[PDB]
Design a protein around this ligand. Structure first.
Ligand code: HEM
Ligand code: HEM
Lengths: 154, 154
């Protein structure tokens, strides 16, 4: 559903984020886990953290961030190829249904946190056209992930 | 569930906020709706809106900001009366379940947007102990509303 311009606009914003990838990744997760403590129950090495400075150093915190960014990157780079995005987003879907038993609405919650951070850090580089492209990428991530949860039971 | 020092902390911050409750309520609802566009399905008058500048002028949006600020202001003033806070929250949660047919997860979500925005208002002065007084208030709101939804068969 993404146009060529919307594609290019996502890839171009993404390149700015991922220039400072782990810094952005951990800002995203720290805002996520602070504002939604319930999401942090799934992570056995920091279910018990409350102080954001401590989250901004927790081993298994910056692991999830680095490999989360890494898998999202794999999506953005391959937006020219819808077969490739489908395949990736199902692996992420299935893994989270099966391996970590995460309620699928948390994807929706985390995407809203991703959006707010991108809006803060790159307000000036975020015109209506990009806001649209980002929104469509978000719905796509959520749809494919949601389907990979149905395909497996849930 | 909430300590006396903690109630005074929440009442101090809230009072400073209520002096400008019009813009604070709208700031919160607009962030809510931009960051979680699916929460707009329930409001037929904005909903077709994407621009935050447009959203802050929508009367359905801004009526609902006052409703939200008003209910939350009578939870905060009555934190000495745990039976009063509890009754007000049951009512909001019973009403939104039955009349407004709103999925209870959006209360999780909006609570986190409220927290995000309090945290940005008092960024200069927001030490760990005020943080968690707000987080305790937050969870109190959420579980009381959730308990009402359970009470009516949802
Ligand atoms: C854009 C959406 C997401 C992406 C791309 C993503 C990516 C990943 C990846 C690549 C891994 C490592 C491989 C694996 O364990 O399967 C992982 C681990 C994990 N994720 Fe996600 N994730 C996302 C959303 C979420 C959400 C919303 C939660 C709920 C809190 C969550 C909870 C977890 C947990 C508990 C682990 C295990 C960490 C560990 O075992 O050390 N994920 N994630
Ligand atoms: C602390 C959280 C909330 C409070 C205190 C609150 C309070 C209120 C109040 C007082 C009203 C006026 C009607 C009535 O008395 O029930 C109202 C209307 C309404 N609310 Fe909420 N609300 C909250 C959260 C939400 C959320 C998260 C949603 C959507 C996801 C929502 C959806 C609606 C809708 C659809 C209406 C009526 C729409 C209209 O005809 O204007 N509310 N709310």
């Amino acid at each position: 559903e993404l146009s060529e311009a919307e594609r290019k606009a996502v890839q171009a914003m993404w390149a700015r984020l991922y220039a400072n990838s782990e810094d952005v990744g951990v800002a995203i997760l720290v805002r996520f886990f602070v504002n939604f403590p319930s999401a942090k129950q799934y992570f056995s090495q920091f279910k018990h953290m409350e102080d954001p400075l401590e989250m901004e150093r927790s081993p298994q915190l910056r692991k999830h961030a680095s490999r989360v960014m890494g898998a999202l990157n794999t999506v953005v780079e391959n937006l020219h190829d819808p077969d490739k995005v489908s395949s990736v987003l199902a692996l992420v879907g299935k893994a989270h249904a099966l391996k970590h038993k995460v309620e699928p609405v948390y994807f929706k919650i985390l995407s809203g946190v991703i959006l707010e951070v991108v809006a803060e850090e790159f307000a000036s580089d975020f015109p209506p056209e990009t806001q649209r492209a980002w929104a469509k990428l978000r719905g796509l991530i959520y749809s494919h992930v949601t389907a990979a949860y149905k395909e497996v039971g849930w």
